[PDB]
Amino acid sequence: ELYTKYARVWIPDPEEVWKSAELLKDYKPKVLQLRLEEGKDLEYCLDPLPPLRNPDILVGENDLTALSYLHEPAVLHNLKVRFIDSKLIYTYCGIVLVAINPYEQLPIYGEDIINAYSGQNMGDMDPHIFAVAEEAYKQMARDERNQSIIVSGESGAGKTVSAKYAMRYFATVSGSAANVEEKVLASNPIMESIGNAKTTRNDNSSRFGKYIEIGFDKRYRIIGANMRTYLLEKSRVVFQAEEERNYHIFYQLCASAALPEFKTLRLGNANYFHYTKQGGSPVIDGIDDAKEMVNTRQACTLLGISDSYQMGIFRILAGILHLGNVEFASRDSDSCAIPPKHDPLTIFCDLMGVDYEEMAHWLCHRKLATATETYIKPISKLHAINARDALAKHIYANLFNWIVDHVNKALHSTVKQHSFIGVLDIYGFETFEINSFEQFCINYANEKLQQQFNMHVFKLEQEEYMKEQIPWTLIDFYDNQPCINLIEAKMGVLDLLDEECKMPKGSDDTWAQKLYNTHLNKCALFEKPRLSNKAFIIKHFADKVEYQCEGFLEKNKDTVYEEQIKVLKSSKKFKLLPELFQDSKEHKKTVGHQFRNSLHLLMETLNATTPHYVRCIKPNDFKFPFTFDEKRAVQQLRACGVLETIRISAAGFPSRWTYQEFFSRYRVLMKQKDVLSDRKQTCKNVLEKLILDKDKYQFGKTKIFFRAGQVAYLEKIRADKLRAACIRIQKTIRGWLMRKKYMRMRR
């Protein structure tokens, strides 16, 4: 047990997630006497134990796996102390690097430190982003195989700062002159304007995965980046929950309605348009959209998008906005019509350069054709609204891919790329008060990435074990495939959603009923919320999440009636709109199936490669420099998978010690008889006496491997021996000295 007197323990507390306590009397096989910092005894009860605390030598170490007890409060303590008192913003967990965002500028990014890391091995140094970049940069040279740095977290956490410095490192150690840093940094305002949103819980959340491939030649001179984007949240364009916004570019554009060149766009205020009024939150406090616009146009001009294309882009976005106001009237249960001289459609046709009567016809009808014959069939007002919103989502997704292709044209260089290093910036696991299809997609992507991470860690552990000659059978593999099969496989939660989109009179209620019928008792990971029939719960990697069924189906659905594209492609007013739609089932695919395919493209990109991982955490909600809210930080660490990573690591042999440093530490416990000339045999003897269960350690060729907890045990028994010796000696010295004071008194 070894809950002894002066054992420290952690106890759960409402205000700061854990508090330190000290066990005031020995435990013996119901209630514990605990001395607290606040008061000398307040008492704690044991249920049908408190988490024990690591010894003081271990806390503050550079690597959270160096701890002997691995659990939430010790991790939170080590990160808190290292951040607050030592101002070290970087820490290691397993392979992962954890970066605690300080909200303060620091001297640590200087070129002298860049040189200090260049050429080092990974463990030789305290952790820094440059040491990941250097590990990638060396492996790229040693082997053909390409390398990725993966950065995960909330968007506030400062992933862009990590990528910025990782590129600065690559530039400096390459000795390159070229000019990639300036261009990649100058791309950020447009990518944030198009691809970036205000969520219920964060402002400037990023709603896509951005992959920057830094290309190198056969000599490792730099060649200039290729930008890719994945996982774009297209549904946000047409739907927002309470006090959300859609992509900032619409509000920047609406804020600019006074500028002379936007007169012809006939803009309103941002709540005048159906695709922006739905959130009820037009203004972010602390941002002037009217000025972020100007920074966007400057970023465009630095990437050399001509003023003509810039006015084409803003003309198209005014198109999308005016399109959204078009309001169909139901003629009949099976037909609809646009009312006469409807003004939003007039202004949309004036913007896009199309004949009003063709758009007015094709919005309300669709064309069937067999090879011999063709029929023009009317469609319901519901289908007409779904068609309009699918067309708006398609125009947006194409405009996004076009702006990203012009970025790539400005960033490319003619030299043949020999190899590259990718920096992937992606959102973390996500959970809200009200929880919806956007989060379901984000959590599916994070399940896939966590599977890849577990693959990689398990592989490198089998390699390290064969380095140390230890049998592979001791490392257990934890596998989340039963959760991915619940979502992506056939009859999964996505498959029954696509199957519900096209079954007649399908609805979120009867989708939920299909979910329950298929999964409710049959699967360990799917659960029903006790008090509702319109929600379901998935036990994700990081946590259980309850998703609410209302309004997935309307978000799920895309079908673009091809004749509406064929009308728009006919436009002759301006160049950009025909350019957009250059290269079918692609139109038929639902949003969820597009997302599933984009995620397969992402995973087949990363699987070609060797990963390196970063995690960013946000320490406090108020951007105070160097302050660390335990209640927020615990949530961030859970969301980044760091805690379930550590839980997986604690199942293994976390603690790995070199024979000579072990011998140095524990000779205090070792009789001068028993130390041999042979260190490995000496330690085998000593440890086999000190810890009777051999299952707690393995004798590798080069290192002792300990299970979680046992190094703390050895440190405790060492401290107890040292204390008993000190008490005996010092009491003897006290009795000697007062015996001499007695001889003085006799004198």
Binding site: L368, A369, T370, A371, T372, P504, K505, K588
Partner: protein, 184 residues
């Protein structure tokens, strides 16, 4: 995924294509022609019998038989030629690769499905098969779950009432008025 074939034998027309398409690849009359005159030229490349658009094109030389009448298949050696033409020539796909779906008028003879099944597995070697009531499919098409359906092709007419996807077999009406008896 391997998409399944949909082959609505009907009568008078064959409608066939791949599942998930919005209109059939193949629409041709379910008609087999054999030549009745003496062939006189030599080296002509004479051909035993013609299916579909061929028998329509050359019809002045031929005797035209419909193998299906009143939704009952009455000549299996014709019908199997029509299926063979559908898979191999018109869709140009080997049916052994992926499943097939077939449609039938309600309340017709029990042995017709057994023969269709036996031919599909034995000769065409399809991996899997199903047969579906036409009037049920007309609701899937019209986007409804509650309906009464007057479905009337060549060969046969029938009414099927369906309420929320429960069919009411006692109320199924079948009638043998059809396009062929309007034609005669």
């Amino acid at each position: 995924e391997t998409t399944a074939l949909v082959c609505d034998n009907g009568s008078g027309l064959v409608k066939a294509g791949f599942a998930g398409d919005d209109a059939p690849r193949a629409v041709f009359p379910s008609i087999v022609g054999r030549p009745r005159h003496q062939g006189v030229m030599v080296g002509m490349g004479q051909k035993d019998s013609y299916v579909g658009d061929e028998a329509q094109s050359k019809r002045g030389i031929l005797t035209l038989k419909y193998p299906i009448e009143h939704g009952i298949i009455t000549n299996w050696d014709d019908m199997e030629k029509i299926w063979h033409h559908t898979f191999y020539n018109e869709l140009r796909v080997a049916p052994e690769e992926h499943p097939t779906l077939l449609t039938e008028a309600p309340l017709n003879p029990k042995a017709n499905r057994e023969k269709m099944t036996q031919i599909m597995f034995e000769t065409f070697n399809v991996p899997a098969m199903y047969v579906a009531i036409q009037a049920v499919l007309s609701l899937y098409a019209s986007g409804r779950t509650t309906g009464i359906v007057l479905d009337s092709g060549d060969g046969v007419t029938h009414n099927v009432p369906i309420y929320e996807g429960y069919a009411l077999p006692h109320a199924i009406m079948r009638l043998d008025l059809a396009g062929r008896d309007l034609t005669d």
